[PDB]
Design a protein around this ligand. Structure first.
Ligand SMILES: Nc1ncnc2c1ncn2[C@@H]1O[C@H](COP(=O)(O)OP(=O)(O)OP(=O)(O)O)[C@@H](O)[C@H]1O
Ligand SMILES: Nc1ncnc2c1ncn2[C@@H]1O[C@H](COP(=O)(O)OP(=O)(O)OP(=O)(O)O)[C@@H](O)[C@H]1O
Ligand SMILES: [K+]
Ligand SMILES: [Mg+2]
Ligand SMILES: [Mg+2]
Ligand SMILES: [Zn+2]
Lengths: 176, 639, 195, 624, 196
């Protein structure tokens, strides 16, 4: 898996948009997308939201968790704890990147939101680094990584798994 | 506090090992041999207690203090009287220190308060001076004795104690020092410099200052290549209540190692068998094996082997002297491998000093005066030939040396002594060395139609001081050209097994030795197609390591001349000297003199050494006569 | 002994990016000739061992047999790695290879490539009701239905729909559906312009 | 309190700059540049970052203005902010990495530099940007950042006393703080520095000479003292051209006039520059550069491209420009198992007529070579070329100073006016040219230095212009020196109507084009890139001759020797130009240089063919 | 879409079609001959009993049997106690590239010869890998758009593979964050064929 594919998975999350067009209910294979009425909010997958924004057909609304006070509390909690804390979204980094890159005009205080998400990302990456070092140094056979998102795992997963494969083979040399 | 007690407990546990017994036995030996320093291998400590080893290497002074306290307690446990004998017991370290292996360039501030192992060359030494440790004083009026302890920034527990001795008691009654009851330790300072081959491009080598105390004094002399294990400290100072904040740094040694072969029984048996195998072929094989990368100059290589082996110097009951050192001169056309043979001897001989005619002076060759670092005392520093005492001096571009500088070489070349009469200093220095010199003729390229004396352009006395003189000519011969070209191109195609294709030699190198003992013998070198060719390999090559061991063992033998050899040598000397115009074309390169007879004796003795024989026999004399016959005459071409 | 096969292996090892060098015909023939020589010497030794009951020859027979096996292993590894690179060619460029690349391949390698191409076409045809699914396309996740493309070289007529085509000339730009341009982009004919 | 509040506010602003600064656009993406660099460097174990002044001005103009006007205090605040941000980016950390490290903040700007001559009193204590040449570097020494002091009498200790940066000392407390009652009073000056409690950093001192083009007419170049510390230490070496950002400062020694200070003028002080950032001027390889170099080496006509790029202003001399290219790249240095070395450097001599651009070629190679020294034979001495023995002013002891061939170690030394050199001075170079070492035995110093450099020499003939009738009398050099040259070019100014017209038009067009704004040439490589390409190849590739190439070389060498031997016999005079084993190894070196241009591990028969053609045109032509 | 056959040198047996394994088994290994070997004297005519030779690992593995009929195998100095002690002091400073490019793979295959020091060779290989992991992970995941020649200089072949994987992960995320991961580009092979 590469980062583009994790972003592809993240693009299936639902967000809210206000369209400037009228459309009847669409019966997509994935699921119905309610009628579109100018000025009224509607929930759609992130990929369709980004596409409609790029075509000047909708205005995006920030998710509930994309709030400065909530994000500051979450960053402080993440810094205080030892393990990974539960995240507002399983694709918070990708959602933040896409929404703030394409609709900053629609999201007030986007710079603060980006900085807080960056802080959380840095803390969690450091925790994952500590976890990997502990796994190798203490010669573990298994680990628990709860509340860790797919993008975080994918950032260094291949390296860690290859190292663990080599280490296991070195641990099982003497068995005939 | 508690950490110090725990460290002392751990170290005492480490040295009480009868329940494998290596350090219990080492301490017993220390007692038996009258020593007060125990050398500890950090690998054993790391094996038995890793945390204690890491702390020792990273917090050196406190850990060493605890270690030495524990050692004193253990020694007292084995024998209390011996412990009372010595003020303190010291600990030296050896083994692998990981990243603490450094050079004077890589020894930086990040290694402060750490144990480090430095490798380098000793450039400067100082005089040994006593340093007061404990002072004892007696009061004649009150009949009581008082003791004082001293320490400085250089002691393990740094504290700037006062140097002034007590002179009176708290009561006014006066005090007198008991010098024979006080304690003093020897103290010396040296400088260790980066190895020039390791320096980066365009950079002069860096240096570090080292402090040797107690037994470690005089373990190293200038010119040595040493490995010093010690602790790295800064010496902060103040003046008028002001500090610059820039501090000198010193290395406080705990162990000094040299970088004298060690012989095992198997190696001794191999050497004895090699000597026994052949009677006449040993010398020829050894000479053939000397500098493999040079296509043959066979007689010159035999002469260089004789030079390395040497003769036997005679001391007479009256006190007269006859030298045993063999001197060789090579005069030649450009590009005939003279400098390469000199460089090979420089790389292989145990003590060899390089010198260039244009880059040397009489002072630099013999000795120099300067002010002592302390007290400004007129002191002497050894020159090249004194540093080469019982060694070799290789002088390249001999014809470029100034005549006045050349004249200073006569006394060393003949008598082996240097007389210093300057700056209120009158000394006789021992410079008993063999001279290997290379030169070009007066016209650059030897003129065969002129005589040897006119080409060489040197005075007969200097030529007489050389045991052998070799005229090496480049004669364009298609077959010789083919052979030399094949050899040279094979040499240039060679690639060492470790290296990969396309690799370039770097300018400079990082520290490669990662232990005090090298973690890594066979008589004959393994065959390599490029190094030796596709020939059937009928001639075998003796390996470099075996050659180094064999020559060391042979140099100690002193063959005794026999009556038959003496008769043959006398007859041959008479024939050599009487023969005038022995060949009408032939001319003498050097005059035949009684020095020629001494040279015959020297060469025969060296040949007998090569065989490891206790007597000089007729074969050795015949070989010496053959060498002299080849060297002393040259045909002159007529146009 | 096995140094020629070692040269065969080293040639491929020196190019770890998958490029196909020219087939080493002379090296392969050398290896085969050496194998025949080894086999003949072993046959003579085996016959003598049977005839005269000389045990001392068995180590030599084993040594030669091991050398033969080593030569075989190196040959097969070389050929198989070449096959892997050729296989990658199909998925990286397409069904029709540039003549430059065809030049390096041996004739037998071209036959292998043609057979593999036919098998892949059959499998891709078998997936769906009509025409199946061409899984050589859609190599990256899709973002937009249409994209902007610039012609990096002259290519001539290019069919958009059966009715209509467009002329590809250098430094012209076209706004086209992505699924019609992916293949030419992967071949270095078009460049994807992001604005 | 108020000062503390102001300092805290400024530190907060620096911290926010480090946390929030971003590069990119909403069309492409965004990167938190400085936070990411700090996080990566800290993980790598490199505790420094480099901050652009323009970025800081973009974030907060007042902060940049303060940093320019009062560098010391605000730089300290910026370093504290950097330490804070480094903790947050890496804060959960693995075992053995608990203690947070200090961060050195380097400074970089796009502003135009100012000269040494322009450094005036009114700029004291300001941030300055200065270009120059490094002429001297000191040894690495230890400078205290933190000290602990202890009382001689009572053992009362004051710990963690901060030290000022730069060339500034500290004044110890005059009196101790222990209780007056009960104990006899503590003596004056009771405090001493505890050796093991001191935290130190590496420091260095440098001399920076003004640029040669900036020197006023008729004046000796001026220099300035530089103070470097931590990661700035040991970055530059003598000969480097640099631009330094620093603080114009004053040495703060003891207030007292100890030893009865008796200066020639009153209230004078010593100036220096406290270095905050170094930029080495062209006059590590990025992956983009390395890919570009690999592309160049693979061009089918790379040899032609490099030759066309050597002194493009000179009208002809194609064979001499091809040989200079080989000298620039060099051969492969080797060490045989017995310990004997074979040199890989190539020596070249141009002997010829006046006004033939020999000196212009030497000047170009000085600029083009990664390491290059230009000297004159007339203005040289034996000690100046190799190395000198002299007295050290501070130590009162003999030391060693390297000459031209020590400064040019690893590069090229261009010796112009080689014929004007004295014979005693010329002879001092023989060892360095072949053994590539310098042996010294003087004044109690016995040492050996490295001199692995290529010699490029130019000279005139004995009679000024080469006279064909005089024959061997045209050359005055000894056979020993001449055998140490791989290639010898006899340059004859041949008069021809057609070539002379072409040369004149080229020279005129060259003088008119001096006004034209510089433009690139399709078939050439600019000097800056060629200089970097040469350095890359020399470190990456050491070629060897192929077994087939060696057989071809062996047979031609034998023929060449016979022809030289026959020619001398017929002429009845031993030729001035010798053909020895050194000339065989010279052809090997030239073949390896040609391969090194193409980054090829093995030299082929075509390489030997070109090497033999170069030898034929240069040295065999001279010898016959 | 090109993936060479992967190395199997750390397992009980090496992979038949692995180029890395063939190169690794090309490396030599000291042996002592336990039987006269006729008709092969030309290559080292008989080779006398007790002779000492250096053989490629593949050839030694072929002739070796547990009862030591044809030859007996001795460990290279790199895997003996002298060097094992050096490794334990600090495994990060030893140059595993110069001391055998396939250091781990070669040492793993030495366990087939049933030496009395097998447990010590095995334990040393594991501790060396563990002691070097943190530096490899940090350098590979934090050296961005920089020269890595000094970072991989001392790494062996197996470690250089891990370093390349770590660099790939770092580069992919940087490309995604900068917005370069969405452009459709010419294939890797096409780039190396038509623009190199
Ligand atoms: N017979 C030979 N065998 C091998 N290499 C040789 C031989 N003759 C010369 N060479 C090589 O050729 C070069 C000769 O240079 P060298 O310094 O040894 O010559 P030289 O006799 O000392 O010359 P000069 O009197 O000019 O200093 C060196 O590379 C040397 O290795
Ligand atoms: N072929 C040429 N193409 C271009 N300019 C040339 C050429 N030959 C000479 N010049 C110019 O003419 C002048 C020649 O002076 P220069 O110092 O280079 O000559 P030189 O050959 O080294 O002479 P000398 O032996 O008298 O020192 C310089 O201006 C040089 O630029
Ligand atoms: K003074
Ligand atoms: Mg010489
Ligand atoms: Mg000139
Ligand atoms: Zn006090």
């Amino acid at each position: 898996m590469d980062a583009a594919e994790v972003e592809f998975l993240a693009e299936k999350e639902l967000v809210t948009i206000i369209p400037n067009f009228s459309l009847d209910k669409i019966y997509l294979i994935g699921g119905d997308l309610g009628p579109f009425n100018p000025g009224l909010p509607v929930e759609v997958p992130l990929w369709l939201a980004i596409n409609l924004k790029q075509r000047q057909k909708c205005r995006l609304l920030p998710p509930e968790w994309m709030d400065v006070e909530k994000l500051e509390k979450m960053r402080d909690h993440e810094r205080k704890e030892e393990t990974f804390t539960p995240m507002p979204s399983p694709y918070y980094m990708e959602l933040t990147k896409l929404l703030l890159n394409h609709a900053s005009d629609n999201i007030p205080k986007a710079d603060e939101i980006r900085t807080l998400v960056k802080d959380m990302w840095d803390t969690r990456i450091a925790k994952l680094r500590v976890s990997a070092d502990s796994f190798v140094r203490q010669q573990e056979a298994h680990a628990k990584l709860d509340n860790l998102t797919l993008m975080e795992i994918n950032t260094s997963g291949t390296f860690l798994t290859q190292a663990l494969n080599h280490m296991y083979k070195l641990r099982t040399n003497l068995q005939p | 506090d508690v950490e110090l007690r725990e460290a002392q407990r751990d170290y005492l546990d480490f040295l009480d090992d009868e329940e494998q017994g290596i350090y219990q036995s080492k301490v017993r030996e220390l007692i038996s041999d009258n020593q007060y320093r125990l050398i500890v291998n950090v690998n054993d400590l790391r094996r038995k207690n890793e945390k204690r080893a890491n702390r020792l290497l990273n917090n050196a002074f406190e850990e060493l203090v605890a270690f030495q306290r524990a050692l004193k307690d253990f020694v007292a446990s084995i024998d209390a009287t011996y412990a009372k004998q010595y003020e303190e017991f010291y600990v030296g370290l050896e083994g692998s220190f990981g990243s603490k292996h450094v050079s004077p360039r890589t020894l930086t501030s990040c290694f402060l308060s750490c144990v480090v192992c430095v490798e380098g060359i000793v450039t400067k030494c100082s005089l040994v001076r006593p340093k007061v440790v404990r002072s004892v004083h007696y009061c004649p009026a009150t009949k009581k004795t008082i003791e004082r302890r001293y320490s400085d920034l250089t002691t393990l527990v740094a504290f700037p104690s006062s140097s002034v001795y007590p002179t009176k008691d708290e009561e006014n009654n006066p005090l007198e020092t008991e010098y024979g009851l006080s304690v003093y330790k020897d103290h010396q300072t040296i400088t260790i410099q980066e190895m020039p081959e390791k320096a980066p491009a365009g950079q002069l080598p860096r240096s570090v200052d080292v402090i040797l105390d107690d037994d470690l004094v005089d373990k190293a002399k200038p010119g040595d290549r040493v490995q010093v294990v010690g602790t790295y400290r800064c010496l902060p100072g103040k003046k008028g209540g002001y500090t610059s904040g820039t501090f000198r740094t010193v290395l406080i040694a705990c162990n000094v190692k040299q970088m004298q072969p060690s012989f095992s029984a198997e190696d001794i048996a191999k050497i004895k068998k090699f000597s026994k195998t052949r009677s006449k072929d040993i010398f020829d094989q050894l000479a053939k094996s000397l500098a493999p990368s040079i296509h043959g100059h066979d007689y010159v290589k035999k002469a260089i082997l004789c030079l390395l082996l040497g003769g036997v110097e005679r001391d007479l009951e009256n006190g007269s002297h006859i030298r045993g050192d063999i001197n060789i001169l090579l005069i030649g056309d450009p590009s005939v491998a003279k400098s390469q043979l000199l460089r090979y001897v420089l790389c292989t001989a145990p003590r060899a000093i390089p010198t260039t005619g244009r880059g040397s002076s009489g002072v630099g060759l013999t000795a120099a005066v300067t002010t002592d670092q302390e007290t400004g005392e007129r002191r002497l520093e050894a020159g090249a030939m004194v540093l080469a005492d019982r060694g070799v001096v290789c002088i390249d571009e001999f014809d470029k040396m100034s005549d006045m500088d050349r004249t200073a070489i006569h006394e060393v070349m003949e008598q082996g002594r240097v007389t210093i009469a300057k700056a209120g200093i009158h000394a006789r220095l021992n410079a008993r060395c063999s001279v290997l010199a290379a030169a070009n003729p007066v016209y650059g390229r030897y003129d065969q139609y002129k005589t040897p004396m006119e080409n060489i352009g040197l005075q007969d006395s200097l030529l007489s001081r050389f045991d052998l003189l070799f005229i090496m000519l480049d004669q364009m011969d298609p077959e010789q050209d083919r052979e030399i070209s094949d050899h040279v191109l094979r040499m240039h195609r060679y690639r060492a097994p470790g290296e990969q294709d396309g690799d370039a030699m770097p300018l400079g190198s990082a520290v490669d030795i990662l232990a005090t003992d090298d973690p890594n013998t066979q008589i004959y070198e393994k065959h390599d197609n490029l190094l030796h060719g596709t020939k059937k390999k009928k001639e075998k090559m003796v390996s470099a390591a075996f050659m180094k061991k064999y020559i060391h063992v042979a140099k100690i033998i002193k063959p005794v001349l026999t009556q038959e050899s003496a008769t043959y040598i006398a007859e041959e000397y008479s024939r050599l000297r009487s023969q005038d115009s022995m060949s009408s074309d032939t001319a003498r390169t050097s005059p035949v003199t009684a020095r020629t007879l001494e040279t015959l004796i020297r060469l025969a003795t060296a040949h007998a050494k090569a065989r490891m024989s206790k007597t000089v026999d007729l074969q050795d004399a015949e070989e010496a006569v053959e060498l002299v016959q080849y060297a002393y005459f040259k045909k002159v071409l007529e146009k | 002994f096995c140094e020629k096969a070692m040269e065969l292996i080293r040639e491929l090892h020196r190019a770890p990016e998958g490029q196909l060098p020219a087939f080493n015909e002379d090296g392969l023939r050398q290896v085969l000739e050496e194998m025949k020589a080894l086999y003949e010497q072993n046959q003579s030794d085996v016959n003598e061992a049977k005839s005269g009951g000389r045990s001392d020859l068995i180590p030599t027979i084993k040594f030669r047999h091991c050398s033969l096996l080593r030569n075989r292993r190196c040959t097969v590894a070389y050929l198989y790695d070449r096959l892997l690179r050729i296989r990658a060619l199909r998925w990286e460029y397409g069904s029709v290879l540039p003549n430059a690349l065809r030049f390096h391949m041996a004739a037998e390698e071209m036959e292998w490539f043609n057979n593999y191409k036919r098998s892949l076409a059959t499998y891709m045809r078998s997936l769906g009701g009509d025409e199946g699914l061409d899984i050589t396309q859609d190599m990256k996740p899709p973002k937009s239905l249409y994209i902007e493309v610039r012609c990096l070289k002259d290519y001539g007529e290019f069919e958009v729909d059966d009715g209509t085509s467009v002329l590809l000339k250098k430094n012209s730009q076209h706004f086209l559906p992505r699924w019609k341009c992916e293949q030419l982009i992967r071949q270095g004919v078009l460049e994807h312009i992001l604005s | 309190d108020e000062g503390q509040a102001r300092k805290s506010q400024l530190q907060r602003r620096f911290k926010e700059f480090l946390r929030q600064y971003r590069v990119g656009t909403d069309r492409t993406g965004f990167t938190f540049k400085y936070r990411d660099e700090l996080k990566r460097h800290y993980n790598l174990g490199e505790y420094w970052i480099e901050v652009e002044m323009e970025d800081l001005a973009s974030f907060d103009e007042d902060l940049a203005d303060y940093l320019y006007k009062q560098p010391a205090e605000h730089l300290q605040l910026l370093e504290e902010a950097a330490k804070e941000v480094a903790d947050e980016v890496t804060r959960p950390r693995p075992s053995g990495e608990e203690v947070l490290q200090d961060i050195q903040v380097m400074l970089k700007s796009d502003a135009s530099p100012s000269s040494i001559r322009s450094l005036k009193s009114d700029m004291m204590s300001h941030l300055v940007k200065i270009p120059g040449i490094i002429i001297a570097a000191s040894a690495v020494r230890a400078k205290a950042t933190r000290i602990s002091i202890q009382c001689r009498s009572c053992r009362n200790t004051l710990t963690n006393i901060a030290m000022r940066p730069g060339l500034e000392g500290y004044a110890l407390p005059r009196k101790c703080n222990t209780d007056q009652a009960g104990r006899p009073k503590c003596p004056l000056d009771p405090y001493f520095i505890m050796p093991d409690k001191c935290k130190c950093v590496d420091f260095q001192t440098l001399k920076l000479q003004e640029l040669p083009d900036a020197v006023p007419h008729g004046e000796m170049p001026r220099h300035m003292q530089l103070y470097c510390d931590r990661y700035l230490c040991d970055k530059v070496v003598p000969g480097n051209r640099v631009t330094i950002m620093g603080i114009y400062s004053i040495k703060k020694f003891g207030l007292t006039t100890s030893r009865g200070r008796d200066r020639v003028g009153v209230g004078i002080r010593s100036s220096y520059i406290r270095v905050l950032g170094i930029q080495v001027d062209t006059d590590a390889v990025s992956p983009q550069e390395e890919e570009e170099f690999r592309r160049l080496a693979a061009l089918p006509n790379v040899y032609e491209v490099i030759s066309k790029s050597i002194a493009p202003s000179i009208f002809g001399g194609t064979d001499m420009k091809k040989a200079i290219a080989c000298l620039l790249f060099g051969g492969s240095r080797k060490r045989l198992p017995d310990g004997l070395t074979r040199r890989g450097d190539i020596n070249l001599l141009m002997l010829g007529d006046p006004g033939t651009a020999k000196s212009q070629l030497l000047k170009f190679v000085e600029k083009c070579s990664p390491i290059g020294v230009y000297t004159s034979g007339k203005g040289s001495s034996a000690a100046g070329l190799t190395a000198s023995v002299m007295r050290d002013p501070s130590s009162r002891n003999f030391i060693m100073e390297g000459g031209a061939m020590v400064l040019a170690d690893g590069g090229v030394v261009c010796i112009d006016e080689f014929d004007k050199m004295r014979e005693d001075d010329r002879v001092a170079i023989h060892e360095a040219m072949e053994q590539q070492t310098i042996s010294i035995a003087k004044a109690g110093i016995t040492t050996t230095l490295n001199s692995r450099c290529s010699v490029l020499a130019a000279a005139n003939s004995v009679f000024g212009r080469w006279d064909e009738t005089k024959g061997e009398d045209n050359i005055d050099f000894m056979p020993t020196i001449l055998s140490r040259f791989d290639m010898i070019f006899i340059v004859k100014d041949e008069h021809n109507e057609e070539r002379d017209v072409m040369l004149a038009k080229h020279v005129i067009t060259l003088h008119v084009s001096a006004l034209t704004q510089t433009q690139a040439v399709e078939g050439e490589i600019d000097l800056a890139k060629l200089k970097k390409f040469i350095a890359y190849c020399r470190v990456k590739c050491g070629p060897r001759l192929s077994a087939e190439a060696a057989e071809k070389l062996k047979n031609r060498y034998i023929i060449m020797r016979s022809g030289a031997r026959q020619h001398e016999r017929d002429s009845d005079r031993r030729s001035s130009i010798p053909i020895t084993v050194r000339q065989l190894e010279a052809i090997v070196r030239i073949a390896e240089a040609l391969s090194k241009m193409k980054l090829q591990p093995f030299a082929t028969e075509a390489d030997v063919e070109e090497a033999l053609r170069l030898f034929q045109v240069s040295t065999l032509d001279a010898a016959l | 879409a090109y993936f060479r056959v992967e190395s199997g040198a750390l397992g009980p047996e090496e992979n038949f079609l692995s180029l890395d394994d063939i190169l690794m088994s090309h490396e030599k290994l000291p042996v002592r001959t336990e039987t006269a070997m006729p008709r092969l004297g030309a290559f080292f005519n008989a080779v006398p009993q007790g002779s000492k030779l250096e053989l490629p690992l593949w050839l030694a593995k072929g002739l070796f049997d547990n009862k030591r009929r044809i030859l007996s195998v001795e460990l290279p100095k790199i895997y003996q106690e002298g060097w094992r002690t050096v490794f334990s002091a600090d495994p990060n400073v030893v140059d595993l590239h110069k001391m055998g490019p396939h250091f781990y793979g070669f040492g793993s295959q030495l366990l087939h010869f049933d030496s009395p020091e097998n447990a010590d060779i095995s334990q040393s290989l594991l501790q060396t890998f563990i002691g070097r992991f943190r530096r490899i992970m940090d350098s590979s995941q934090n050296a961005y758009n920089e020269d890595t020649s000094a970072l991989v200089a001392r790494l062996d072949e197996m470690e250089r593979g891990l370093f390349q994987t770590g660099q790939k992960g770092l580069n992919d995320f940087q490309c995604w964050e900068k917005g370069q991961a969405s452009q459709i580009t010419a294939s890797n092979l096409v780039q190396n064929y038509k623009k190199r």
